[PDB]
Swiss-Prot record:
Expressing tissues: Plasma.
Single GO BP term: cellular response to calcium ion starvation
Domain Albumin: 1-173, 174-366, 367-558
PANTHER family: ALBUMIN, SERUM ALBUMIN-RELATED
Name of the encoding gene: ALB
Positions annotated to bind Ca(2+) 1: E2, E231, D236, E239
Protein name: Albumin
Length: 560
């Protein structure tokens, strides 16, 4: 009995939480009550299987049981069976659920509702998040919940609760988005490009993290990490949590053979331990490391070793180059790896292989400099413009690259792209590239998945599917869509006045930024000067007006 199996391993508290998340991720539009009803009904069944491990259906698989339970309400896929039935659900998860934005009541209410029923208060939290982030790494969602519970347990019992709660809540809201985004990239990678692509990502990443680890150790880590993520992303949340639990147990036992930063991590509670390992900083780089050119360029057995086991061999190259380059982004390491593999592939067939692949590190020169130069440039501009203006610049730049993309998606992505400047430009040259390049992959993957829903730009499709590690370069190369035909003006498409006033400060920029997009979709060929000009005026119509809706706005459309 697979269910009984897992119920024991995870206990009841987690089992309940994990199944609530799975449901809230498969049927994101269903009310809280229904999921609650199904979790309990499901939980009871689990309890009876613990006893008689042969009580009617305790033999069935998790999918079967979860499927049948959801179909008792999903009729608000179910026509299919076991394999097809599950895949169906997976293809219908929605990255952009049009749910009502969540609004936070007065601190007073939250505290009362928390104190009264704590288990309910926390379940609805997990519920709200899971439905909005159908791919959130389940195991980490429990860490946020515990961290969420601590916020209230401490603040609701203090002088100025609000001053205590709000900040801590903000911090969580953000980090949750970051976490959700990182996770979305791992799943996309697994689902769209295959496990080979995720493994490569892992080797490079863990190699940078655990420089001291021997190649076969990392490989061991990579293989399990892959299973964990493969399972969470496919919805096998219980087995994900389990395997994720083992992996942490393992990593802590074998500490010394891995990294010397895993100390602080391995002496705390499961959840906290897991989160700690996953985010552990890189380990100090080994003292005496032979130059790479030794076994990978100069040696004359390259093609032989490549022929025998291209996988392991290339795998080794990645590990070696990565372990000593924590100043490189994972994506740059995968590009280099791809360039090396391509070189051997051709060189090895040639007459004198050695002569052909002897200058491979000169092929790397351009690949390493491109990111550095791009980053150096963009942080300069950033420091000169500030976050807001910098976001505006990217808004214009991106709308010109892919005009078809919907305004809400352009606004969301450009704003996130701007945040990369705030998060990374502060770090020193040394840590900029991992920060920047890896962050840009997460944000451009957001654009790619939101776009995969309703595709309107072949230039976006091509950059998103041609290659995973080259997405950023593909997008950066785009300039302005020359075949794009401008759009006509639509009165209501630039609509507002006073209702925008009650709106927060940020809610206002997101209003001027939305207009800016619309404007460029109208005047593609316009210039940085013009827009920057017509922009200022936009503020005016906000202060003046704040019926001027129609009046002050008429003097706006005219001048526009
Ligand atoms: C604790 N065990 C089980 C782990 C779980 C999830 C990710 C882990 C990672 S990781 O490198 O994938 N860490 C991820 C973050 C994450 N939460 O997945 C990253 O830096 O992109 C390394 C080592 C252990 C991990
Ligand atoms: C760290 N920060 C400042 C950035 C460095 C390099 C590229 C960045 C990009 S990007 O990948 O879109 N790169 C830009 C390059 C340019 N401005 O000419 C683009 O394609 O429009 C977006 C946001 C921040 C970036």
């Amino acid at each position: 009995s697979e269910v009984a199996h897992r119920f024991k391993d995870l206990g009841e508290e987690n089992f309940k939480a994990l199944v609530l998340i799975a449901f809230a991720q498969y049927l994101q539009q269903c009310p809280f009550e229904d999921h609650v009803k199904l979790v309990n009904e499901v939980t009871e069944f689990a309890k009876t299987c613990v006893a008689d491990e042969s009580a009617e259906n305790c033999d069935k698989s998790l999918h079967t049981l979860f499927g049948d339970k959801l179909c008792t309400v999903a009729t608000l896929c179910c026509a299919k069976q076991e394999p097809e039935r599950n895949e169906c659900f997976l293809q219908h998860k929605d990255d952009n659920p049009n749910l009502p934005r969540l609004v936070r009541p007065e601190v007073d209410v939250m505290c009362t509702a928390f104190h009264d029923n704590e288990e309910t208060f926390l379940k609805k939290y997990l519920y709200e998040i899971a439905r909005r982030h159908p791919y959130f790494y389940a195991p980490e969602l429990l860490f946020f919940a515990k961290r969420y519970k601590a916020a209230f347990t401490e603040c609701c019992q203090a002088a100025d609760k609000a001053a205590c709660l709000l900040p801590k809540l903000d911090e969580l809201r953000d980090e949750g988005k970051a976490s959700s985004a990182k996770q979305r990239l791992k799943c996309a990678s697994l689902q769209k490009f295959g496990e080979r692509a995720f493994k490569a990502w892992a080797v490079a990443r863990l190699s940078q993290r655990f420089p001291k680890a021997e190649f076969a150790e990392v490989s061991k880590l990579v293989t399990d990490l892959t299973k964990v993520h493969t399972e969470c992303c496919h919805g096998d949340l219980l087995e994900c949590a389990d395997d994720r639990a083992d992996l942490a147990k393992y990593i802590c036992e074998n500490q010394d053979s891995i990294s010397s930063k895993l100390k602080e991590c391995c002496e705390k509670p499961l959840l906290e331990k897991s989160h700690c390992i996953a985010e552990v900083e890189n380990d100090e780089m080994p003292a005496d490391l032979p130059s790479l050119a030794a076994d990978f360029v100069e040696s004359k057995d390259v093609c032989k070793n490549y022929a025998e086991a291209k996988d392991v061999f290339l795998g080794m190259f990645l590990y070696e180059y990565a372990r000593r380059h924590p100043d490189y982004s994972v994506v740059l390491l995968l590009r280099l790896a791809k360039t090396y593999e391509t070189t051997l592939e051709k060189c090895c067939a040639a007459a004198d292989p050695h002569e052909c692949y002897a200058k491979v590190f000169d092929e790397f020169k351009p690949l390493v400099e491109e990111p550095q130069n791009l980053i150096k440039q963009n942080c300069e501009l950033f420091e000169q413009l500030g976050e807001y203006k910098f976001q505006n610049a990217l808004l214009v730049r991106y709308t010109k690259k892919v005009p078809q993309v919907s305004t809400p998606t352009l606004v969301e992505v450009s704003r996130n792209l701007g945040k990369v400047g705030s998060k990374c430009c502060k770090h020193p040259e040394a840590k900029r590239m991992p920060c920047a390049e890896d962050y840009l992959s997460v944000v451009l993957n957001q654009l790619c998945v939101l776009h995969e829903k309703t595709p309107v730009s072949d230039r976006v499709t091509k950059c998103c599917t041609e290659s995973l590690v080259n997405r950023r370069p593909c997008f950066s190369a785009l300039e302005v869509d020359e075949t794009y035909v401008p759009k006509e003006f639509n009165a209501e498409t630039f609509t507002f006045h006073a209702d925008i006033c009650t709106l927060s400060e940020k809610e206002r920029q997101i209003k001027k930024q939305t207009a800016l997009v619309e404007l460029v979709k109208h005047k593609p060929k316009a210039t940085k000067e013009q827009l920057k000009a017509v922009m200022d005026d936009f503020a005016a119509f906000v202060e003046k007006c704040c019926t001027c809706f129609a009046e002050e706005g008429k003097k706006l459309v005219a001048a526009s």
